[PDB]
């Protein structure tokens, strides 16, 4: 009967939506805090700084990580609240972001912020390494990673994907310690200052300077990682900054 069907669907819809809406909105706040603490944990992990517990991570992160702002169009340090900078929100607004062309959008990211935060790791009063956030569209979700670049501006010290929504086992292997550890020692550029990090389907030759094995059965997610690095290491990303990092 029409009367029974509308009653059950409405009643079932209301109870389930209320539970879902309450759970999502209510636990969102706790989730928001937990996720933020994670990024400080990731920057430390890639930096090689062992931290454990929210206070150790927050305390060690503030002291040891020197967030700074960089203008991509010039690759030079700028002044702002780097510690409280949300590059993601900026990339969504035309005021502090640009729209990429089909040709330019190698990483498949719709927009790129005019200014992006970088993190400097300081063993003492100097920079022992610089950590650059790079993101690019995956098969299922955007994949955000941290790349620890040594003071040389060429050698990569560490890699970690702090945001991914690819399928675990296939595309979620950006989190696999073995795959991330494979990046240590690789070179981001060639002699001609052109991106040379390449994700090799089927496995890079052992000892390759710029060869990281792709994610098995996950070409689309591996393509995103390549697309991530092909853009952010390029002209419109951190390319100019790394040349400057390279000279100083």
């Amino acid at each position: 009967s029409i009367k029974k069907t509308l009653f059950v669907v409405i009643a079932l819809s209301l109870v389930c939506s209320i539970i879902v809406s309450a759970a999502a909105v209510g636990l969102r706040d706790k989730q928001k805090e937990n996720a933020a603490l994670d990024k400080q944990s990731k920057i430390l992990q890639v930096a090689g700084i062992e931290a454990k517990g929210s206070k150790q991570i927050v305390e060690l992160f503030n002291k040891s990580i020197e967030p700074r702002l960089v203008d991509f169009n010039t690759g030079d340090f700028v002044e702002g609240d780097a510690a409280n900078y949300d590059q993601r929100k900026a990339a969504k607004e035309a005021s502090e972001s640009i729209k990429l062309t089909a040709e330019q959008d190698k990483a498949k990211i719709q927009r790129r912020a005019n200014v992006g935060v970088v993190y400097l790791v300081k063993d003492g009063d100097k920079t022992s390494k610089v950590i650059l956030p790079v993101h690019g569209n995956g098969l299922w979700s955007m994949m955000y990673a941290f790349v620890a670049v040594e003071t040389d501006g060429n050698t990569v010290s560490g890699l970690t994907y702090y945001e991914q929504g690819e399928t675990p086992g296939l595309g979620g292997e950006v989190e696999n310690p073995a795959w991330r550890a494979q990046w240590v020692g690789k070179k981001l550029f060639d002699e001609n200052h052109k991106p040379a990090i390449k994700i090799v389907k089927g496995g890079a030759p052992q000892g390759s300077e710029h060869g990281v094995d792709g994610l098995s059965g996950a070409t689309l997610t591996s393509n995103g990682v390549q697309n991530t690095f092909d853009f952010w290491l390029g002209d419109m990303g951190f390319g100019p900054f790394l040349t400057k990092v390279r000279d100083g």
């Binding site: 389907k201 089927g202 496995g203 030759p205």
Partner: protein
């Protein structure tokens, strides 16, 4: 004690042809490609070795590889002044172990299935064994050849009931297994020449990087001309290099009626059309766009597949109209993979395999259309 007419009305005469005779014809058809392959395999290896080493350094290399000093023991010479006998002898030391391993390992699976399931052994395995051994890199490890034939014989043929009862090309299915399971041994610059410590890209890889002008034999320093690729004096799979040798064998089986000329014609039509289309469109960045049809013919395994594997009767379409479509799809797919797929320098194995999947559908479209004419009594 008196059978009925059923058993007695059998056609009292039969054609001399039988399945056993068909297979030997295909088996003999590849002998010219096989023999040249061994000769080419030894020649390529000897040239690279002299280009990489000399003096006592060459002697140490020859002494540390059973392929080299076994050739010396039997009367050959690893020096560059070696004649055809030593080159063919050295190439045999690579082909024969691969062919022996493939024959023995694959034959074991053939007999095992027939024995357990009470089937009589079938002679189709003669073609599968020889073709698989002639489409692998010369340096392929034997243990990988054993696995490749095992996958091809078992997964592609036996589990479907054996010869005449499968849908996918067994030999190419085995090669795909090695291609995707152990790509390092069947893809790259270290497997297509048997000179240890030698790195050399084959012609197709070279054209995709730079252009036809980049077509160089690193060992000799001499340019690779179209004539070179046609005769097969180029690096590659033992058996694919010589377009001339394959044509000679292909002519016989085509003449004997064992290999379909509609499939072969379709492959050429698809290849010429698409490659010419790429030529006209052009690409300032992708060098594969400018490869003409006549270069596509003498490069890679296009010739071997068109002549000896696309013509696999069981895996192809069973209708004359479908055979054209089946061949055209192979030729189109091969050029497409060759040109617009960066990962693969050649795409014939994948191309034939793709076409195998769709040959039954092409027949269905054709056969259902015949039924529409029949249900209309052919308009009579």
């Amino acid at each position: 004690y008196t059978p009925g007419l059923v058993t007695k009305r059998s056609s009292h005469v039969r054609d001399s042809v039988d399945l056993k005779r068909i297979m030997i014809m295909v088996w003999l058809a590849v002998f010219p490609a096989m023999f040249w392959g061994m000769y080419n395999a030894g020649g390529q290896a000897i040239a690279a070795l002299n280009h990489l080493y000399s003096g006592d350094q060459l002697a140490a290399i020859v002494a540390g590889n059973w392929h080299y000093w076994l050739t010396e023991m039997l009367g050959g010479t690893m020096s560059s002044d070696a004649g055809w006998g030593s080159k063919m002898l050295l190439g045999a030391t690579y082909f024969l172990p691969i062919y022996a391993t493939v024959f023995i390992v694959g034959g074991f699976w053939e007999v095992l299935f027939c024995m357990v399931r009470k089937h009589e052994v079938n002679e189709g395995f003669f073609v599968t064994s020889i073709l698989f051994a002639l489409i692998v890199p010369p340096t392929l490890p034997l243990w990988q050849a054993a696995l490749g034939i095992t996958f091809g014989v078992v997964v592609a043929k036996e589990v479907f009931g054996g010869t005449g009862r499968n849908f996918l090309n067994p030999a190419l299915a085995g090669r795909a297994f090695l291609f995707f399971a152990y790509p390092a041994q069947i893809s790259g610059d270290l497997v297509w020449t048997a000179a240890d410590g030698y790195s050399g890209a084959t012609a197709l890889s070279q054209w995709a990087q730079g252009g036809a002008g980049a077509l160089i034999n690193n060992a000799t320093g001499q340019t690779i001309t179209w004539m070179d690729a046609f005769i097969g004096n180029i690096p590659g799979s033992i058996g694919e290099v010589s377009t001339l040798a394959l044509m000679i064998g292909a002519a016989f089986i085509v003449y004997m009626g064992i290999a379909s000329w509609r499939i072969i014609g379709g492959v050429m039509i698809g290849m010429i059309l698409l490659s010419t289309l790429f030529n006209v469109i052009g690409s300032d960045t992708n060098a594969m766009f400018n490869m003409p049809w006549h270069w596509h013919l003498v490069l890679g395994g296009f010739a071997f597949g068109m002549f000896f594997m696309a013509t696999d009767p069981v895996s192809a379409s069973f209708t004359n109209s479908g055979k054209w479509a089946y061949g055209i799809l192979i030729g189109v797919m091969c050029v497409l993979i060759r040109v617009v797929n960066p990962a693969y320098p050649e795409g014939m194995m994948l191309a034939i395999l793709f076409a195998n999947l769709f040959a039954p559908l092409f027949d269905h479209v054709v056969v259902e259309r015949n039924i529409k004419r029949r249900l209309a009594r052919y308009g009579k």
